[PDB]
Subunit: 154 residues, 2 copies
């Protein structure tokens, strides 16, 4: 158990779902938690700069992220989804805690490579007072779009 | 200058463009060469197993790959595109030639990591009598699909 802070920074080249634009927001859901960002109107490169805080019980179940086009009068169209795992992040955190302040500032603790078994668009760095994981996610099931976020815990 | 053999092996989870299926084929084009594979009817996981042979003049210009849904009565719908570079491959080839048969069979000469500046879905290996590059490409501008190919030269 712990508290995962997801800083949702921005979307890049998101899909159009309302002809001229989209009104994108993100839903994160982990088991049964569902948290949402604010809506950015008429944008496919939204700068959400929005923080979500997730309560982790089970560090091994994936965290799902979905982008939607907000529309007041109909169900919101999906604009891509991605999953990520926070196992490696939680382990990098345990380590840094057990080493103490002897671990130098700016140290990259772990590099995670994009593969066919994840949604990274580039190598994800776990970096050190705070351990942080920088993620650039390739959205699945959509013709374009990426989301950039940074993870914190706890 | 040289001859690039592109073994187009298969497509994986390609997009639907004719409701129930697609009839996918690939066009490769490098500057002004345009070469096409055979059409696989009613498939989104086509096993093309088809060879294309490209004449390279300029090793630094990208090779573009596009998948299309063949339809006799209308322009063929695009089903994704990708670009790849053969610079690193040609250099791995020069090397193996200059070393000679002292270079062990099965040796991985180069690993190329997926990044936001390429279309790899996983790390691409350049491997040795023949130098070969294995590529798994993530298609762009489409909601799903990958193409697996192997490069040979010359
Ligand atoms: Ca809308
Ligand atoms: Ca068709």
């Amino acid at each position: 158990v712990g508290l995962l802070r997801i800083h949702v920074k921005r979307g890049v080249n998101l899909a159009i779902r309302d002809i001229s634009s989209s009104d994108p927001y993100i839903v994160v859901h982990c088991g049964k938690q569902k948290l949402k960002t604010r809506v950015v109107k008429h944008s496919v490169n939204p700068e959400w700069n929005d923080d979500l805080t997730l309560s982790v019980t089970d560090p091994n179940l994936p965290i799902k992220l979905t982008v939607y086009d907000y529309d007041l009068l109909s169900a919101d169209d999906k604009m891509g989804e991605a999953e990520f795992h926070i196992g490696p992040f939680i382990e990098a955190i345990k380590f840094a805690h057990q080493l103490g302040p002897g671990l130098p500032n700016g140290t990259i603790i772990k590099k995670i490579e994009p593969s066919r078994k994840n949604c990274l668009s580039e190598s994800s760095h776990i970096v050190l007072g705070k351990i942080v994981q920088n993620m650039f996610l390739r959205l699945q099931h959509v013709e374009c779009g990426e989301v950039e976020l940074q993870l914190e815990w706890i």
